[PDB]
């Protein structure tokens, strides 16, 4: 862990991966989820690449990550898009994908503790 997905995979491969999976899963968003840059407080996910139903909201996705990580009540986090962009949690991921998707076709998200930002 701790190598960005973008450094582990060529641009050509990432584009193709997104194109191929979207053919088979047209109602799914391809999402890369990684620990915030310089993040030490939260634990790592087993897997980085997710296929998320596009009708789902950002808030539902947060609940899913809380479950993957098996977090305690006291560990809180925000799900930021790209490097550090905050997005309303009430937003459908289909909406976020349309606006924030990367050039390779992946949506990049990072999770970071809320306390890092003064919460």
């Amino acid at each position: 862990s701790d190598r960005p997905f973008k450094q582990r995979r060529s641009f050509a491969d990432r584009c193709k991966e997104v194109q191929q999976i979207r053919d088979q899963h047209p109602s799914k968003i391809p999402v890369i989820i990684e620990r915030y840059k310089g993040e030490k407080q939260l634990p790592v996910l087993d897997k980085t690449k997710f296929l998320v139903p596009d009708h789902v909201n950002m808030s539902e996705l947060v609940k899913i990550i809380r479950r993957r990580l098996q977090l305690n009540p006291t560990q809180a986090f925000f799900l930021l898009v790209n490097q550090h962009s905050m997005v309303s949690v009430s937003t459908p991921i289909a909406d976020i994908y349309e606006q924030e998707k990367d050039e390779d076709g992946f949506l990049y998200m990072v999770y970071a503790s809320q306390e890092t930002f003064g919460f």
């Binding site: 997905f5 897997k47 690449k49 997710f50 139903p53 479950r67």
Partner: peptide, 19 residues
């Protein structure tokens, strides 16, 4: 190593309650 996608299932989604 991220070879395969982690697919969020509908079943996993119906496990997410709301107050």
């Amino acid at each position: 190593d991220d070879a395969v996608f982690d697919i969020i299932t509908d079943e996993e989604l119906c496990q997410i309650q709301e107050s």
